[PDB]
Amino acid sequence: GRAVWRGPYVSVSLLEQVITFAKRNPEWWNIGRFQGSKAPEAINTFCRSSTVLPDFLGLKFGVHNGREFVGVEVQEAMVGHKLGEFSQTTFR
């Protein structure tokens, strides 16, 4: 994968989406997210190649798969992977 000494990749567009979300919901971002409350809304994105951050913990992401935005709620075990690994593009 990407060389560890060069760091991760995260898209700039994804960061802007999260920053706007935090401003809209300051109370949940600071306190609610850690007591266990669910996110008040979801963030739709096309950034399937971005890495999942633990600051994205309790966040709900709608990841595009070609047709719709598949909901993905971040868990601790999903840390370190790409958003595109949890949104399937083919169906049988």
């Binding site: 760091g7 991760p8 600071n30 306190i31 850690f34 951050l53 633990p54 600051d55 840390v79």
Partner: protein, 72 residues
């Protein structure tokens, strides 16, 4: 039809306490379990003090355990 003789062995816990427990065979060296009741997380009392309750109520975001893998 004949029951076996039961002997005693010394078992040392994580806290240094010793217990005598039955055993079919005899062991001269004390036995050290890998995990005991005190070390295991399930056997923990749920009584909390006011100081602990206040700490849980007042928590601010802490993002260190992730993005540290970057700064290195």
């Amino acid at each position: 039809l004949v029951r076996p003789l039961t002997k005693a062995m010394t078992v040392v816990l994580s806290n240094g306490a010793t217990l005598r427990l039955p055993t079919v065979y005899a062991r001269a060296k004390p036995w050290f379990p890998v995990m005991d009741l005190h070390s295991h997380n399930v056997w923990k009392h749920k009584i909390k003090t006011d100081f602990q309750l206040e700490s849980e109520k007042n928590i601010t975001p802490d993002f260190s355990n992730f993005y540290n893998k970057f700064g290195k």
